[PDB]
Amino acid sequence: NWTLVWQDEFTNGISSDWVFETGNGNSGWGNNELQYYRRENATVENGNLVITAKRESIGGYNYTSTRMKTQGRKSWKYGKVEARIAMPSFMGSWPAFWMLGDNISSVGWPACGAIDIMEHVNTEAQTHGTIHWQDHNNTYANYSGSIPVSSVTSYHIYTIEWDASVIKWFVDGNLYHEASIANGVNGTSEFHNNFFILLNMAIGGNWPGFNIDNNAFPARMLVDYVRVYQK
Numbered sequence: 001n002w003t004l005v006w007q008d009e010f011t012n013g014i015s016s017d018w019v020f021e022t023g024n025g026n027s028g029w030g031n032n033e034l035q036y037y038r039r040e041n042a043t044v045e046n047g048n049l050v051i052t053a054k055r056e057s058i059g060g061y062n063y064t065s066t067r068m069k070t071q072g073r074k075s076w077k078y079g080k081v082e083a084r085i086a087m088p089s090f091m092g093s094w095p096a097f098w099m100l101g102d103n104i105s106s107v108g109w110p111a112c113g114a115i116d117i118m119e120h121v122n123t124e125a126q127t128h129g130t131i132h133w134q135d136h137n138n139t140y141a142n143y144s145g146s147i148p149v150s151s152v153t154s155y156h157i158y159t160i161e162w163d164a165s166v167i168k169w170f171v172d173g174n175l176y177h178e179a180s181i182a183n184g185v186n187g188t189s190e191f192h193n194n195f196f197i198l199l200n201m202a203i204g205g206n207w208p209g210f211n212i213d214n215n216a217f218p219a220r221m222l223v224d225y226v227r228v229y230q231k
């Protein structure tokens with residue numbers, strides 16, 4: 001059976017296991033994103049994390065939002081990782097629930113690996129699950145699947161199950177994507193390391209594009225909980 005090993009239910013504020021990013025990072029967090037991250041864009045309302053993206057000017061940027069992470073506090077090798085999320089749907093939006101290898105501080109991205117548990121862009125009627133890594137030839141690799149979601153603005157449950165064989169992705173318990181990491185096949189060795197969790201909402205960038213609905217602000221992403229189970 002699955003054993004619960006960590007959670008944030010956001011019932012009494014935001015856990016001290018989260019650290020917040022500030023600013024636009026290096027070339028828009030590597031994706032030419034337009035937002036400046038802050039602590040102030042994260043609040044709790046009635047047992048939910050609220051990440052609010054705003055049209056707000058600071059440090060030469062015209063949008064603000066939150067990127068938070070458990071890096072340096074909590075990380076896991078294998079498990080079931082899930083969040084119950086309701087996210088906005090508007091041109092320019094790019095919310096994510098994802099994971100990075102603990103060793104990013106030494107080896108960088110994408111050698112560290114990334115598991116995107118949920119991404120959404122713009123007004124798409126689907127959500128994406130992806131791994132990113134450096135394959136056996138040291139070439140940047142990604143492997144993505146998607147599932148139709150007619151209402152991303154409603155709460156859905158976004159899950160991975162991760163073991164030494166496979167990562168499986170689910171929305172509302174519906175399996176839609178799977179990736180073998182057995183024996184480090186296709187150079188997937190770095191998914192046999194500890195990973196930490198991130199939550200964010202980016203505004204613009206290479207994938208969603210730079211057509212921003214300025215009339216969609218402020219915009220809210222609500223997270224009822226994040227949980228990690230292991231065997």
Ligand SMILES: OC[C@H]1O[C@@H](O[C@@H]2[C@@H](O)[C@H](O[C@@H]3[C@@H](O)[C@H](O[C@@H]4[C@@H](O)[C@@H](O)O[C@H](CO)[C@H]4O)O[C@H](CO)[C@H]3O)O[C@H](CO)[C@H]2O)[C@H](O)[C@@H](O)[C@@H]1O
Pocket residue numbers: 029030031094095096098108109110114115116119132
């Ligand atoms: O040298 C070859 C090319 O390098 C390019 O610069 C790299 C930069 O893009 C890269 O930025 C990544 C960023 O893309 C990545 O985005 C995340 C996604 O991959 C996915 O996991 O989803 C999350 C959530 O939506 C998303 O943020 O995030 C990582 C971690 O923040 C970030 O590092 O970083 C590398 C390593 O530094 C840069 O080399 C450059 O722009 C190209 O011109 C060049 O061809």
Ligand SMILES: [Ca+2]
Pocket residue numbers: 009010011047048223224225
């Ligand atoms: Ca909650």
